[PDB]
Amino acid sequence: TSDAVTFITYVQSLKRKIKQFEKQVELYRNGQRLLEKQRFQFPPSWLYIDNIEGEWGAFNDIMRRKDSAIQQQVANLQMKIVQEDRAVESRTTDLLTDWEKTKPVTGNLRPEEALQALTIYEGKFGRLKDDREKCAKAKEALELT
Amino acid sequence: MEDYQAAEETAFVVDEVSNIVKEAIESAIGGNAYQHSKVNQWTTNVVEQTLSQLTKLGKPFKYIVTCVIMQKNGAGLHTASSCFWDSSTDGSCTVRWENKTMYCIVSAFGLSI
Amino acid sequence: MEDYQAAEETAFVVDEVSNIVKEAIESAIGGNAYQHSKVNQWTTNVVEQTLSQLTKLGKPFKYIVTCVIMQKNGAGLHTASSCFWDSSTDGSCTVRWENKTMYCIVSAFGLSI
Amino acid sequence: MCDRKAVIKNADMSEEMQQDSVECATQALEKYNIEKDIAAHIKKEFDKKYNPTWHCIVGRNFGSYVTHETKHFIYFYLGQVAILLFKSG
Amino acid sequence: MCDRKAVIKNADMSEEMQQDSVECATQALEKYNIEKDIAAHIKKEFDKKYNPTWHCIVGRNFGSYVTHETKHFIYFYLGQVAILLFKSG
């Protein structure tokens, strides 16, 4: 759903543009009017105005019918993200405890075997950090939770 | 005479199970056309009504009711059920129901306690 | 410790039944495409293999195997099943498999004898 | 050749086969005088070309409300002849 | 109530759906005045009852050959109001 809510965020970014494009069409639907009363010989590949205005109206209607609808049903997504970030916090606490236990600060340990153990720790810690940042970014993108 | 009556009381009659399933489908589906969002809803109602009637029978057997709702778009329909039980006391009934736009097959199994 | 082992032996292991079901589906079907003349053979082979491996377990469970095969044409498919038994002994398992052009839903029910 | 300029009054379609609709309706109008047979020829030609199934009407004084397949709808004019062709079914 | 009679030209369908069409589409005609809006009624309503995808055409003088599913074609005259309605989906 992250990617999904990404597009959800994306579609909000389009809304203004929609209005923008809409008014362009408005200005467009004015200018092309002059086109017929300036006696223009319309080319065949030239698509005609009513075609695109109808399909664009249908475009806006379908978008505001289904994207909006799928946007309200986000509570399940809300609780999914909530439990995901609780799991992230739990794993962060587990990693904190693992770090406190695993401290190789003593020099009696053979340096490179402790280096590889710390490398395994850093790999799983990087995965934990990736999970945390992904959950935070999904939360702020969805922005309802 | 009493033994036959007791056996019929304790026997899995296919006719009444089929009638129960048909009534459940009629009450939950009836003449309604197919919508993708309420398939869960009719499947739940059909199975619930069927199991409720079957347990209202009081007839001493474990019940299994499965419902498959399919749409008339050229999709092929095949439901096969071969099982292992005691044939003398355990039974089954498959009810296949149609409207202008939907298949609905409900399979009911009754097994000895 | 012995009691736990015996209970597991008489338990309806949903994972084991699901593994048997998926093995039967793969052996009977594999990666072949849709053929309406092959649906009967595919369903029958899946059901009989599932029955054979469930019986090879040796558990005191009456086994009920149902198979649903539907070729992908955009048709949303739901199979629902709500039943009645003593849930501490009997179990059920629904395995759904799909490839580029197929859906197959297999329901296996084990009821303690 | 009678230059019947086409103005397409509604479409969800690609432009190439919209002009294909224009040309095919031009040929059908030049070939037949029966509006029924105009629809016959245009509909058969499209069913043959881009795989069935369409529905075509030709008339003068008409409205119609339709559900069609995406990229599979056109409604234009040739001369005084309103021509509609959509795909659904 | 003006008995605008459903005088029938072409039909492969049930008399009941024929004549249900007749009352409710006449209902369409009665409140409204506009051919396309009458079509909006009639096609939307049988997408409601006899399920999508219907296709309706309201006019007076046209030629339409279309494909319709079995028992799904009505084409007749209600006054000079020629009414065509077929299912395709």
Chain B CB contacts of C105 under 8 Å are 68
Helix segments in C2-112, DSSP class H: 2-10, 14-28, 36-57
Q: For residues C70-100, b (16+ Cβ closer than 10 Å) or e, as one string?
A: bbeeebebbbbbbbbbeeebbbbbbbebeee
Of B87, B81, B92, the residue nearest B14 (C-alpha): B92
Resolution, expressed in angstroms to one decimal: 4.5
C78/C69 Cα distance (integer angstroms): 12
D15/C58 Cα distance (integer angstroms): 68
Q: Which residue carries 């203004």 as its tokens?
A: A16
Instruction: State the first-to-last Cα distance of chain D, in angstroms, to the nearest integer.
Output: 36
Interchain CB contact of B32 with E (< 8 Å): no
Chain E CB contacts of B101 under 8 Å are 51
Chain D CB contacts of A50 under 8 Å are 8-10
Q: Where are the beta strands (DSSP E) in chain B?
A: 61-71, 79-84, 91-99, 102-112
Residue A36 DSSP SS3? helix
C56/D77 Cα distance (integer angstroms): 73
Of B40, B34, B26, the residue nearest B97 (C-alpha): B26
Task: Answer whether B40 sits within 8 Å of C65, measured CB to CB.
Answer: no
Interface of D with A (CB under 8 A): 5-13, 15-16, 18-19, 22, 76
Task: Answer whether E36 sits within 8 Å of D65, measured CB to CB.
Answer: yes
A67/B39 Cα distance (integer angstroms): 22
Structural domains of chain E ordered from first start: 5-89 (3.30.740.10)
A32/A36 Cα distance (integer angstroms): 7
Q: Which residue carries 């605008």 as its tokens?
A: E4
A60: its two tokens = 């806006």
For residues B73 and C74, the answer to whether their CB atoms sit within 8 Å is yes
C75/C78 Cα distance (integer angstroms): 10
Q: How many CA atoms lie within 13 A of A41 on its CB side?
A: 2
Per DSSP bridges, beta strands B79-84 and B61-71 are unpaired
- Contacts with C17 (C-beta within 8 Å, 6 or more apart), sequence order: C54, C91, C93, C108, C110
B75/B84 Cα distance (integer angstroms): 29
Q: Read off the amino acid at residue A16.
A: R
For residues E54 and E43, the answer to whether their CB atoms sit within 8 Å is yes
Residue C91 DSSP SS3? strand
Q: How many CA atoms lie within 13 A of B72 on its CB side?
A: 13
- Contacts with A137 (C-beta within 8 Å, 6 or more apart), sequence order: A2
Who among D64, D65, D89 is closest to E88 (CB)?
D89
Q: Which of D1, D5, D12 to mutate to test the interface with A (most CBs of A within 10 A)?
A: D12
Task: Answer whether D12 sits within 8 Å of A55, measured CB to CB.
Answer: yes
The answer, yes or no, to whether C and B have at least 3 beta-carbon pairs within 8 Å is: yes
Chain D CB contacts of E72 under 8 Å are none
Shortest distance, CA D22 to any CA of chain A (angstroms): 8
- Phi and psi at residue E10, to the nearest 5°: -135, 140
